[PDB]
């Protein structure tokens, strides 16, 4: 459509925060995603050469709390950025990669009914 639907920050928080909570509830799978990747502590100095736009759950949460998403697709784009970054950087046998794949399965199931409700 040409006409932006207008969303209030608290409407987005009430609708979308439970979908982010569903990812946090996955344990162990969300544990690597709860804070930003720290390449110094992890000893991976190539990380920001490969991942140009880092993203993690705590940043998405803060963006929802501070009204930085005008529309739900911007939130979905950040969750997907987090996933794509982890699939790009990590080997397919790693825990982080397989945990990412489980988070993406969970998010897909939670986000669809929410998007139907916001349209
Ligand atoms: C709570 O604070 C901590 C601090 C960081 C820690 N962290 C680990 C640790 C480091 C020690 C060795 C080990 O083995 N780690 C490890 C690896 C996988 C799983 C686990 C669990 C035991 C937590 C499940 C540990 N590596 C991570 C890799 C990434 C990553 C990369 C690269 N690119 O995208 C992502 C996402 C992000 C965070 C990581 C997770 C949590």
Numbering used by the authors: -2 to -1, 1081 to 1197
What does the paper say about this structure?
EP300 and CBP broadly regulate the activity of other proteins through their protein acetyltransferase catalytic activity. These proteins contain several highly homologous domains, including KIX, bromodomains (BRDs) and HAT domains, through which they interact with, dock to, and acetylate target proteins, respectively.
Since recombinant CBP BRD was more robust in biochemical assays and crystallization studies, Kd values were determined for all compound-CBP interactions by MST, and co-crystal structures of the CBP BRD with five of the seven analogues were determined. Introduction of a butyl group in meta position of the phenyl (compound 6) did not change the binding affinity relative to 5, and the cocrystal structure with CBP showed that R1173 establishes the same Pi-cation and hydrogen-bonding interactions as seen with CCS1477. Among the analogues tested, only compound 6 maintained high activity against CBP but was considerably less potent against BRD4, indicating an increase in target selectivity. While none of the analogues were superior to CCS1477 in terms of binding affinity, substitutions were well tolerated if productive interactions with R1173 were maintained.
